Design a protein around this ligand. Structure first.
Ligand SMILES: OC[C@H]1O[C@H](O[C@@H]2[C@@H](O[C@@H]3[C@@H](O[C@@H]4[C@H](O)[C@@H](O)O[C@H](CO)[C@H]4O)O[C@H](CO)[C@@H](O)[C@@H]3O)O[C@H](CO)[C@@H](O)[C@@H]2O)[C@@H](O)[C@@H](O)[C@@H]1O
Ligand SMILES: OC[C@H]1O[C@H](O[C@@H]2[C@@H](O[C@@H]3[C@@H](O[C@@H]4[C@H](O)[C@@H](O)O[C@H](CO)[C@H]4O)O[C@H](CO)[C@@H](O)[C@@H]3O)O[C@H](CO)[C@@H](O)[C@@H]2O)[C@@H](O)[C@@H](O)[C@@H]1O
Lengths: 210, 213, 210, 213
């Protein structure tokens, strides 16, 4: 029952920065603490174990410190391949427990999304299914909230989101959310709205159609 | 180069079962504790289970106790994970991970990982059927097509149990979509109104459909 | 590479009959030969092993004989619970090989099917899919051939069959075959026919609609 | 009473993988050779694999060599069967079966059987996508919705590679139906005709769709 608490959840930084990620254990774990790197869609990679022992092959700009209940991972001079999620892990002989992960992303200025809503095509509607798409284009940071409203009632369980990686050109994110319904269900209501909340919007933005 | 490769992932409905396996290349598992770890949609890692050398100790996260089992096969180098009574929060990427380091000790980190296999548990463990009619001085047939339900079984009667002579309800067929289909038919005089009562206990659904020309 | 050959494939008999099922091996297997019973949807059950040793609990009307390449299973006085599929099996220390199975069914007179074709409902068609059903009612024996013809072209891969067990009242079989298509695909053709071949039909019977 | 129970069956597409397991009640597997047998739709039984005590010998039917693996776990009494590169003729009911008799000998029949688990392999290992348009003095968005394909990946360009600024093609999403969906969008001046070129290599499909108001 050791609880591991990693902070912060998200860190924005630039190539060349020195950054530190903290992990705190609810009780002393001596130095039984490992740090891992993970890229989206890839396996985790071990960087540091025994709190401060660098795995052979890992570059020296990574270091770890601490003992007891407080640990730190430092990257001294971020490079472009270091933007990733970092996880701490208390390991024991026959189990392990991980902190919640820290996503390290490229810092830029705040950018509000541009929002677009698209109705299902007539071709698709004919074959028995309606897909409604909402596009959030080029925003930063990534934290965005998209709610689907059908005749003013919040939808839940019938939509899926997909977010890009940080754009090669402008370090923003884009996001699509697709609300999927049957022909029949689609036909029962009139107003289809997508409502978006983001740090760079003064108030939530709604786009809709009839 | 040392490799781990998971297999067996896929889609499951809540309540269902799924088994994963992990095979390896270029090392032998026998001196290693092996583990399963999963990455949940929020991005964080959760330790799932561990199995020590010789299978002496099998440990599982509190959330999967009594539902998951881990096994190993040291002669041909496989690890297994059985997942039963699966829940929406089991949805994740599952990795097999070796515990070890350059020189083994009684407590090492996870130094080698498989690429992961995607496991998706959808929230609907049941689905009521759709019911469509099979529309008809001699002998005539009619019936009801009971399409796309899950899991089995459905029950059909006619005229709330009043019509039983000539009723044939066929064994369900498993469609490529993972949903079941069956038809129920009855032969009746060509010379009255007929209603088939579809009962689907798993989804507490009960449908009534009138079949007519 | 022992090949096991069971005959006949199907046996029709009555309660009270004495029947025999034969299994032949391509080379001597001494007496390493087992017989199993299996009901539809149930596990197999061992009856006889070592060619003639009755498993404890198995009724004495079952017996087995033979040695070498020729074996026989005899049921001396069939009862109603003996209608089932019977399988022979040559077993070895680390593998086994089964004959093709003999389905034992209740003998009756030949009965030709009555054939019905049903088009998809308008309700279903609207939601994007057409199911066409063909019914073969109360026939005997079970061996029937159902071919789907769409504008005179044989369909394959887009239909599923389902057969009942021998009817409690008249010992016949019934069979449904369902051809499943999309809205679109359905709409492309005119004539939908089901053609049925059965021992009790003088020639194949076709039922169709437009 | 002695019992065997298989788990892990389901639907697979040809080429895919699936793992089965077998657990037991009221006896221990360690003194028994354990087997997998399958019943094919024609009705006959086919022996699939055997694994002797201590895993000393693993034998498989000629039709599954190099594709199936059997394992056992004597400490917690499980047997496993991994099935890879599955084929339509693997479609069957799979049983786990104990080899044994009242007094063990070097060659016994199969005296106890599980109830079986249904495994269905459908013939389509690939499926091309359907492509639907996302229809649009300022800044405007349009795109193509690429729905229901398998397996990954699809490729999208616009104007046969002539339009690349502002193109966002999102990561595919796995739908509850087992088929993938993705959208590709581009922002263009509100004031010209736009065509998205969907390439699906696994199914040798290539679609062209014009997006317009
Ligand atoms: O998960 C722990 C490690 O497991 C693998 O390494 C194996 C591990 O075996 C342990 C060993 O236990 C103790 C120590 O070896 C020592 O202090 O002496 C004690 C008395 O002999 C002994 O308990 O052996 C045990 C079985 O006898 C076994 O249960 C233990 O887990 O550690 C040794 C090295 O210490 C390795 O040789 C084993 O292969 C690896 O996965 C390792 O990375 C893990 O940390
Ligand atoms: O699939 C065969 C049987 O397997 C299980 O029964 C086990 C089986 O072990 C065999 C035994 O081999 C030989 C004989 O015991 C004897 O003639 O002596 C020979 C030399 O000792 C020996 O080879 O043990 C072997 C390992 O040492 C093993 O590989 C063999 O398979 O048979 C014995 C009884 O003969 C049982 O005690 C074992 O548990 C059961 O599944 C049985 O039903 C199978 O027929």
């Amino acid at each position: 029952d050791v609880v591991m608490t990693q902070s912060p959840s998200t860190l924005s930084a630039s190539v060349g920065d020195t950054i530190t990620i903290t992990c705190r254990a609810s009780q002393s774990i001596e130095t039984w603490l490992a740090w891992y790197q993970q890229k989206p869609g890839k396996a985790p990679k071990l960087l540091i174990y025994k709190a401060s022992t660098l795995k052979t092959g890992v570059p020296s700009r990574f270091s770890g410190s601490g003992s007891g209940t407080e640990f730190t991972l430092t990257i001294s001079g971020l490079q472009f391949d270091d933007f990733a999620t970092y996880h701490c892990q208390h390991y024991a002989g026959y189990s392990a427990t991980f902190g919640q992960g820290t996503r390290v992303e490229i810092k830029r200025t705040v950018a509000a999304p541009s929002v677009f809503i698209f109705p299902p095509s007539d071709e698709q509607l004919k074959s028995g299914t309606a897909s409604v798409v909402c596009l959030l284009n080029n925003f930063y940071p990534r934290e965005a909230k998209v709610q689907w409203k059908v005749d003013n009632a919040l939808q839940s369980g019938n939509s899926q989101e997909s977010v890009t990686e940080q754009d090669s050109k402008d370090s923003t994110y884009s996001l699509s959310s697709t609300l999927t319904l049957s022909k029949a269900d689609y036909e029962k209501h009139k107003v289809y709205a997508c409502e978006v909340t983001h740090q760079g919007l003064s108030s939530p933005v709604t786009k809709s159609f009839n | 180069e040392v490799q781990l490769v998971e297999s067996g992932g896929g889609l499951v409905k809540a309540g269902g079962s799924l088994i994963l396996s992990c095979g390896v290349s270029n090392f032998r598992i026998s001196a290693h504790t092996m583990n399963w770890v999963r990455r949940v949609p929020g991005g964080g890692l959760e330790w799932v289970a561990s199995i020590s050398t010789s299978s002496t100790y099998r440990d599982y996260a509190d959330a999967v106790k009594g539902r998951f089992t881990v096994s190993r096969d040291d002669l041909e180098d496989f690890v297994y994970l059985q997942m039963h009574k699966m829940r929406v929060e089991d949805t994740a990427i599952y990795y097999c991970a070796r515990k070890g380091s350059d020189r083994l000790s009684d407590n090492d980190p996870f130094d080698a990982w498989g690429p992961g296999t995607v496991v998706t548990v959808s929230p609907a463990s049941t689905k009521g059927p759709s019911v469509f009619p099979l529309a008809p001085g001699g002998t005539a047939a009619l019936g009801c097509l009971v399409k796309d339900y899950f899991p089995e079984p459905v029950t059909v009667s006619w005229n709330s149990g009043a019509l039983t002579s000539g009723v044939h309800t066929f064994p369900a067929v498993l469609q490529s979509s993972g949903l079941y289909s069956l038809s129920s038919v009855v032969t009746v005089p060509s010379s009255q109104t007929y209603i088939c009562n579809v009962n689907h206990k798993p989804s507490n659904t009960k449908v009534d459909k009138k079949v007519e020309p």
